[PDB]
Design a protein around this ligand. Structure first.
Ligand SMILES: [K+]
Ligand SMILES: [K+]
Ligand SMILES: [K+]
Ligand SMILES: [K+]
Ligand SMILES: [K+]
Ligand SMILES: [K+]
Ligand SMILES: [K+]
Ligand SMILES: [K+]
Ligand SMILES: [K+]
Ligand SMILES: [K+]
Ligand SMILES: [Mg+2]
Ligand SMILES: [Mg+2]
Ligand SMILES: [Mg+2]
Ligand SMILES: [Mg+2]
Ligand SMILES: [Mg+2]
Ligand SMILES: [Mg+2]
Ligand SMILES: [Mg+2]
Ligand SMILES: [Mg+2]
Ligand SMILES: [Mg+2]
Ligand SMILES: [Mg+2]
Ligand SMILES: [Mg+2]
Ligand SMILES: [Mg+2]
Ligand SMILES: [Mg+2]
Ligand SMILES: [Zn+2]
Lengths: 118, 134, 48, 299, 74, 177, 80
RNA sequence: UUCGGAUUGCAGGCUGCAACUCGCCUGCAUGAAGCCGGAAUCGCUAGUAAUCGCGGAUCAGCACGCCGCGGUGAAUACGUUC
RNA sequence: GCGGGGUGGAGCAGUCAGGUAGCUCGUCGGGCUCAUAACCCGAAGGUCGUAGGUUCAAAUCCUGCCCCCGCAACCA
RNA sequence: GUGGUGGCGAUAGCGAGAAGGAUACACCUGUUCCCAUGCCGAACACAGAAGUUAAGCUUCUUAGCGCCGAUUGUAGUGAAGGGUUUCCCUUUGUGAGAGUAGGACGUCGCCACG
RNA sequence: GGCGGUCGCCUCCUAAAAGGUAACGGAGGCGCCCAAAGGUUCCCUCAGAAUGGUUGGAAAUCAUUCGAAGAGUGUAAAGGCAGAAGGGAGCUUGACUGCGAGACCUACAAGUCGAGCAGGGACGAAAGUCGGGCUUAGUGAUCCGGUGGUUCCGCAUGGAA
RNA sequence: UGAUGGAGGUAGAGCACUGUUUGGACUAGGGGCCCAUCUCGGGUUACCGAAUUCAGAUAAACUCCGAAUGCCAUUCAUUU
């Protein structure tokens, strides 16, 4: 007998605490990240209206695919340029409760280079 | 009867307004002695009533004391002027409100129960009435 | 023995800060990087 | 404090001053006790005795003023306490030296075919003059120097403790407590002995690099004591020690229940230890100890 | 012996619900977070709630068992 | 890898049949093994713990974590934070290697060995083994030891019950009484 | 696994010297003897007096007489 | 400790109607205290002390005791205050 | 309520100023003596009233609590 | 449908039971890589897609627990009086807690893949 | 009146659901501590209980399960905090300088909170947080002196005093 | 004065926390007796009983709850 906690639940406990000081507005939307075993997802979210303004993911059929780190960089670029079409420049990065180390960092760095300001 | 320990050595006398909060029905025994006036009951009075009941019952049946002297009270000795802090604790009282069943009995025929509770009532500073459990 | 001390600026020697330390836990002179209002820059400050 | 005269005059003047100070503090305590005793008598009297209660408060004021002008007696500086005991027992032949020759590469041979044999619970003095080989011989026994010729055999019952002349057994970088750290002793045991050597409380966390030569000598001695060896190879032990600590060192060694190989140019220290046999250098001469030591010194 | 007590600290609400206050106005003095700082409201070093802007004070619920003060400019 | 090899090829198909497991993921496996040496003697002398830790490392091959008292106790002369106790957690291959040596080398060297207990289950399918003395492990050298000490070996498994854990451990090799 | 904090640990082969049984494992122990192993490799060889394949409990086969019943001891000494 | 040989396990040998309480001896195993003994105290002046064995009485059996026997074989006595 | 005290069988130190538990008489065992006393030699007898703290470590410092003893507990 | 991400006091929970994986989410397979464990690739991190729905997770059933909870009555009490006045009573307004009828196994959005 | 007690500060009850509110009313604390027990970034979740387990005992360490707080929060109590204010780790010194709209408290003197602005920074990828510590005690006016700094004054003038 | 919106934990009430407390059931453990004593394992007073649970009380310094009033406020209404 041994129970291994759900990693999503453990992450979401950290996410709530990240979100106590990070929240999206119309002029500074939240850049929320969801990371799976296979994929990574990005959403630009306005928490005041509770609506997502732009979105990209490794499932978009426009990302060539490869190492999960370099698909995160591909997602970061794609969400940044989709957000640019809607006039989004400034955002606050919501790391989703993940450590800002690897795939998430690759997505975040790719978003900075493609026009998002954060 | 005395509490083994108390959080505070000294306590307000308090007030006794209204009917008893709880313990207004016979709960364990067949007959109860209900207080019809409110009054402090001392642990000495509780004991006198208890012995008056049990003895007449001739160690027969069961007796429940439904009140406990939770509250302490102090006094000052003769020759002591007013002031200089609250007096030392002197005794223990249960504040009893009208409608509280002070005692219950069971295991004895009604004739003995009615006379048993009569003898106890004469030991208490409160007027009382016999109450049959419902 | 907790005591009150002054932290002097090692550059200009202005006695810039009032603080305190336990001498038993900090036998040596407390050294801190503190802003010197005279030089208007962060400088090494040492107990004098 | 600066006196005119010599060491004895300083001791005479100082001892008298501390005596006269001690008597002053005694009389000030008596007067405080007197007031205190009356204050208590009034304090416990009946509340109906108004005058005594009044006098009690008046004397309480004098008692307070007394206790605030009452000189504190300076705490007399504590002297070292040494209790050196061997864990095991000495043999009739603790150390065997046979036909041992040694020379420092490029220098004349210090001794040739040196052969001696210690007896056990013996005070063995290695006499000589400066630069004659005394410290070389002791280094030879421990193993620092490998003999050019001969053999040095220690009985399996012999545990050896070495006190080097130049205090080369301490880590200057580490603290006092770190130096004395041993696998055989727990923390509170180490602190208790260091307090016996006048290292009190956080004085043991001081770096050895900031201590004086005399305080370092105590740490080395403490290392020797903590070994509980039955053979003590001591090279000028009283060096750097204050005169009071020297007498303590000599007296305690005298009672040591083990063999002592000692070197000392201090005439007082050797007398206290009560040497049995003296080994003269460079002319090897295993001799019974006596005032003939002076004869060898003259010659 | 007894006979001691600290000076009272005048804690509690200092601005009313529906009242217009200037920025920096103290809304609530308290030990601990008996009431939480809401929109446009900050909490001081001793838990005092103060307005960050000019607006109307509203004491609101924070979920099930907590309260909250906010300031809403007009 | 030998014991891991045995587990994947032999143990797994059998346990599925015995307990009628619909999916292979139900098969109990050894999650981790925690060897714990409770050394209260560190109070009297700190080095006894130091020598204990050295031997513990050689037995497992991992530097142990020195556990510390979470609470002060005057009866044991124990202060909160004092380093009493050491543990090692073995996972993956290092776990299987150790379990193999324990089954095939260590246990036979136990003085008058008549098997390991069969009631030593926590009720949840975790078995803990109390080694009375060292020197059963070949790494101890039988001469370095000054104070003979034992250890608590906790085998943690994913079995939901004692019965499955008992079976899993038996087929992996366990001289149950 | 952290570097330079753990004791040296290498794959090794234990041998039961009572029967020569050998198996592959890992250990921190060293020895002055090495042997070749199937699959084309060489590992240090450690000598073990008793293993699970030579221990009386595991094997079940004893090597003594299980003592002598005193009734049997009495009858043997006197032939009754 | 290759000192010491207590204690214990097992196996035997004898005497005896019988050796559990209570015998002596043997083999194997086991291998205790003890590192020369505090205050105090004993014997002995030569073939003695010291040490080494041997025989005998009692006695089925059973002594480290007792009685006797020979072998080897010393040290010291100034002196009579205590 | 104001003080003083709890350490071996008893009486005392050590307590201020933290490190290591003793002294006096007594008790027990053995000596010496015809015997007893005196005397000699050995041994025993307390983790410091008790429970928490402070500290590396307390008999010691801090705090409480229970015991024992001298006072007081009301004045014109 | 599933996966993200929110608002609303748990009427959103908990326990028990049932079903599902196409995708997706997970277990899962590894320590070469960045990075990591006061020991341990368990975790964190990274790389991966053999197996598995067993668990998590989603959907469904259950009120057993937790939560929500009207009405009536009562306690208390503002105001106005009264008596036999430490207490008690009348009138007028207000009105609990308790205990209950009941409600409830959520609702309202946005995005992505189907 | 005396004797005893008290004298400033903090927390509670009294105190009558804003605030305030007396008694020689009922209870406790303070005259500090911390170089991290401060800042920040990241991470973590407790006390107990059951069961199993060498030394090991009611109870020292280990494992699983249960466990919403029954722990902890340096120090009294109250209020608060496990989206931590509790716990660990890296780097740090914001326990910054000049200030300060506006408030609270208040006889006065004082006391309390404070967004925000500038200078120069710490941590962080960034958002951002940081002008000590879960909050509220840990303090003392002026006069007179000490020490450091100073583009101030300097009794005819330059100095000095 | 009315309406509206808020802060605040008192009266009452309750026990969900903390103290105080009654009875019942059951009980680890706790006292003596015998058998067995290496003090090792039992069988009992309807012997004492933790904790648990069932029922029932109690509180200035207890609270899962909680009024009436009072209080603060509103570019509000009416009179003043
Ligand atoms: K009556
Ligand atoms: K016999
Ligand atoms: K003898
Ligand atoms: K015979
Ligand atoms: K993994
Ligand atoms: K599943
Ligand atoms: K529900
Ligand atoms: K930190
Ligand atoms: K309750
Ligand atoms: K109340
Ligand atoms: Mg020399
Ligand atoms: Mg107050
Ligand atoms: Mg502050
Ligand atoms: Mg010998
Ligand atoms: Mg003669
Ligand atoms: Mg002869
Ligand atoms: Mg209701
Ligand atoms: Mg009020
Ligand atoms: Mg109020
Ligand atoms: Mg803190
Ligand atoms: Mg001039
Ligand atoms: Mg002039
Ligand atoms: Mg009430
Ligand atoms: Zn400067």
């Amino acid at each position: 007998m041994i129970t291994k906690p759900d990693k999503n639940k453990t992450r979401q406990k950290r996410h709530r605490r990240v979100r106590n000081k990070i929240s999206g507005t119309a002029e500074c939307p939240r850049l929320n990240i969801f990371r799976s075993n296979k994929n990574i997802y990005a959403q630009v979210i306005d928490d005041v209206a509770g609506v997502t303004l732009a979105s990209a993911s490794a499932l978009d059929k426009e990302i060539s695919g490869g190492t999960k780190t370099e698909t995160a960089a591909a997602v970061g670029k794609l969400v940044a340029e989709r957000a640019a079409e809607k006039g989004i420049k400034k955002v606050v990065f919501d790391r989703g409760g993940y450590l800002y180390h690897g795939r998430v960092q690759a997505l975040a760095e790719a978003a900075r280079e493609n026009g998002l300001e954060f | 009867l005395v509490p083994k320990r108390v959080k505070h050595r000294r306590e307000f006398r308090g007030k006794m307004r209204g009917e008893a909060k709880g313990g207004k029905e016979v709960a364990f025994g067949e007959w109860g002695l209900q207080a019809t006036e409110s009054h402090w009951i001392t642990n000495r009075q509780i004991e006198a009533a208890r012995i008056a009941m049990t003895r007449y019952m001739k160690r027969g049946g069961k007796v429940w004391i439904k009140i406990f002297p939770h509250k302490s009270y102090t006094s000052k000795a003769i020759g002591v002027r007013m002031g200089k802090g609250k007096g030392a604790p002197e005794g223990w009282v249960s504040p009893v409100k009208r409608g509280k069943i002070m005692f219950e009995i069971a295991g004895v025929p009604e004739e003995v129960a009615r006379e048993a509770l009569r003898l106890a009532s004469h030991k208490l500073p409160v007027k009382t009435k016999i109450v049959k459990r419902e | 023995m907790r005591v009150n001390i002054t932290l002097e600026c090692t550059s200009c020697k202005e006695r810039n800060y009032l603080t305190n330390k336990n001498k038993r836990n900090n036998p040596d002179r407390l050294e801190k990087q503190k802003y010197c209002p005279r030089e208007r820059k962060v400088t090494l400050h040492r107990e004098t | 404090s600066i006196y005119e005269g010599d060491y004895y005059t300083y001791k005479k003047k100082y001892s008298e001053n501390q005596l006269l100070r001690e008597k002053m503090i005694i009389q000030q305590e008596k007067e405080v006790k007197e007031l205190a005793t009356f204050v208590q008598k009034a304090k416990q009297a009946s509340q109906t005795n108004h005058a005594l209660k009044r006098m009690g408060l008046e004397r309480a004021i004098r008692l307070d003023k007394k206790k605030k002008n009452l000189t504190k007696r300076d705490k007399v500086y504590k002297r070292v306490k040494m209790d050196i005991k061997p864990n095991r027992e000495v043999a009739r032949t603790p150390l065997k030296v046979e036909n041992v020759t040694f020379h420092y590469p490029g220098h004349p041979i210090l001794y040739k075919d040196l052969s001696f044999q210690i007896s056990g619970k013996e005070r063995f003095l290695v006499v000589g003059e400066n630069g004659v080989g005394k410290s070389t011989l002791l280094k030879l026994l421990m193993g620092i120097n490998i003999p050019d010729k001969g053999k040095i055999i220690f009985n399996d019952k012999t545990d050896v403790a070495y006190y080097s002349q130049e205090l080369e057994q301490l880590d200057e970088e580490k603290t006092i407590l770190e130096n004395v750290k041993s696998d055989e002793y727990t923390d509170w045991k180490l602190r208790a002995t260091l307090s016996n050597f006048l290292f009190y409380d956080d004085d043991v966390n001081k770096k050895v690099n900031v201590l004086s030569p005399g305080e370092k000598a105590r740490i080395v001695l403490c290392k020797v004591l903590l070994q509980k060896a039955n053979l003590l190879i001591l090279d000028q032990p009283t060096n750097h020690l204050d005169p009071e600590t020297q007498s303590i060192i000599g007296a305690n060694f005298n009672l040591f229940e083990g063999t002592i190989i000692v070197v000392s140019h201090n005439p007082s220290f050797v007398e206290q230890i009560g040497i049995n046999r003296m080994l003269i250098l460079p002319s090897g001469n295993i001799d019974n100890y006596s005032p003939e030591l002076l004869e060898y010194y003259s010659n | 012996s007894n006979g001691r007590d600290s000076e009272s600290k005048r804690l509690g609400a200092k601005s009313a619900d529906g009242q217009t206050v200037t920025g920096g106005s103290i809304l609530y003095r308290q030990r601990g977070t008996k009431i939480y700082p809401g929109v446009n409201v900050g909490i001081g070093g001793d838990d005092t709630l103060f307005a960050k802007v000019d607006g109307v004070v509203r004491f609101e619920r924070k979920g099930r068992d907590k309260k909250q003060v906010s300031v809403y400019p007009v | 890898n030998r014991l891991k090899e045995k587990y994947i090829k032999e143990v797994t198909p059998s346990l599925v049949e015995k307990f009628n497991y619909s999916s292979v993921m139900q098969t109990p496996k050894v999650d981790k093994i925690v060897i714990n040496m409770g050394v209260g003697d560190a109070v009297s002398n700190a080095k006894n713990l130091d020598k204990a830790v050295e031997e513990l490392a050689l037995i497992t091959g991992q530097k142990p974590l020195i556990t510390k008292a979470k609470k002060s106790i005057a009866g044991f002369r124990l202060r909160e934070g004092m380093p009493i106790g050491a543990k090692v957690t073995l996972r993956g291959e290092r776990m299987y290697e150790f379990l193999d040596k324990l089954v095939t080398v260590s246990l036979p060297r136990v003085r008058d060995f008549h098997g390991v207990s069969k009631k030593a289950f926590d009720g949840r399918g975790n078995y803990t083994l109390g080694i009375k003395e060292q020197l059963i492990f070949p790494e101890v050298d039988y001469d370095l030891v000054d104070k003979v000490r034992g250890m608590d070996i906790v085998i943690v498994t994913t079995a939901n019950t004692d019965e499955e854990s008992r079976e899993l451990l038996a087929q992996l090799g366990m001289p149950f009484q | 696994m952290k570097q330079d904090i753990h004791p040296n640990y290498q794959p090794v082969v234990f041998m039961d010297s009572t029967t020569g049984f050998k198996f592959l494992s890992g250990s921190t122990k060293g020895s002055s003897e090495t042997v070749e192993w199937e699959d084309g490799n060489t590992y240090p060889l450690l000598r073990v007096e008793v293993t699970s394949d030579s221990h009386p409990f595991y094997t079940g086969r004893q090597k003594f007489t299980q003592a002598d019943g005193r009734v049997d001891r009495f009858n043997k000494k006197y032939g009754l």
